[PDB]
């Protein structure tokens, strides 16, 4: 390992999903639609009605 | 674009033809004349230019109909003035000035395009048996099928 | 009543084809080297 040739273990790492950046990507509504996919997202943590 | 042919002003010479209308049905003559005019029939046909020939129609007056002549088949026309559908002359119209009856019929078989409108200018219907246009020495053309 | 769509560069230009002062009627002035409007006075 020569410091200008570092290589992570195959399978050690992979890129985070950046949603909301384009359309070809596949997130632009980002996820869901029309519902409780507001910033609150208040599915009250575990319950129905 | 591998080698198919398209005619232009160089190439595409066009002849004159005389067609007696006497003894003919209106549509049956009008359609075939529309073909001579659009310029099919010849194999140097190509859509974006006038490949068509010139057609004089002699004896417009002797053109023939069927079921109902002066009866039934009306020729309507609005003037874009309100209620003014001054839309009369029955298909009878050949009594009055028939060269329009034929030229209109044949024109209705031509495409609405500027080219189609140029192609229509090559018709020359005449109700009488003689034509002025001998100088462009026309041939007679027997009306096929 | 207000415009419903904007005039194009080109529309507005066709509109202004008649909008121009034309060359004044002028003539060879007093033999004094001047230049004056037609039918109007020489000035000294």
């Amino acid at each position: 390992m020569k410091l200008h040739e570092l290589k992570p273990a195959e399978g050690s790492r992979k890129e985070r999903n950046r949603v909301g950046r384009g359309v070809a990507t596949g997130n632009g509504k980002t996820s869901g639609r029309g519902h409780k996919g507001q910033k609150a997202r208040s599915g009250g943590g575990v319950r129905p009605g | 674009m591998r080698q198919t042919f398209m005619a232009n002003e160089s190439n595409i010479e066009r002849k004159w033809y005389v067609i007696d209308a006497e003894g003919q049905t209106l549509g049956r003559l009008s359609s075939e004349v529309a073909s001579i005019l659009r310029g099919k029939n010849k194999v140097t046909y190509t859509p974006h230019v006038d490949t068509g020939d010139y057609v004089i129609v002699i004896n417009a007056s002797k053109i023939e109909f069927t079921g109902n002549k002066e009866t039934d088949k009306v020729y309507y026309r609005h003037s874009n003035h309100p209620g003014g559908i001054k839309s009369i002359t029955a298909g009878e119209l050949r009594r009055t000035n028939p060269e329009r009856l034929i030229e209109n019929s044949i024109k209705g078989m031509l495409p609405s395009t500027r080219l189609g409108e140029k192609q229509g200018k090559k018709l020359f219907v005449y109700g009488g048996a003689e034509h002025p246009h001998a100088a462009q020495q026309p041939e007679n053309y027997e009306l096929r099928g | 009543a207000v415009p419903k769509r904007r005039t194009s560069k080109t529309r507005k230009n066709k509109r202004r084809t008649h909008f121009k002062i034309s060359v004044p009627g002028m003539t060879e002035c007093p033999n004094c080297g001047r230049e004056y409007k037609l039918s109007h006075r020489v000035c000294k």
Binding site: - | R2, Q3, T4, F5, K40, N41, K42, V43, T44, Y45, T46, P47 | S8, K9, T10
Partner: protein, 116 residues
Amino acid sequence: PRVKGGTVTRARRKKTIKLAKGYFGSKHTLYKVAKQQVMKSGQYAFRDRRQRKRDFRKLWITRINAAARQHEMSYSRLMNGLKKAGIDINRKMLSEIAISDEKAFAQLVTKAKDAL
């Protein structure tokens, strides 16, 4: 760190706008309009690439039909007669032969009227 936005995108939009060349006025100037016009331009180009293949087939068919009509035979029967004789030579070829060599096309015509 902070990525100041500048100068990737003035050069993107520059590309798309350069794509809109012969376009009328604002369609060849602004990015939005040019983007629309080029997208649709591509969509039309995709349909029209398919349909062109139709337009040319139909052209040859009309001219062939013409060459046949000159010989008192319909295109409809000249094709069946060629197939029956197994001539298997396409319409672009047939039309161009009709235009370049009336004699040879005549030979084909008789070959088709034969075997009927």
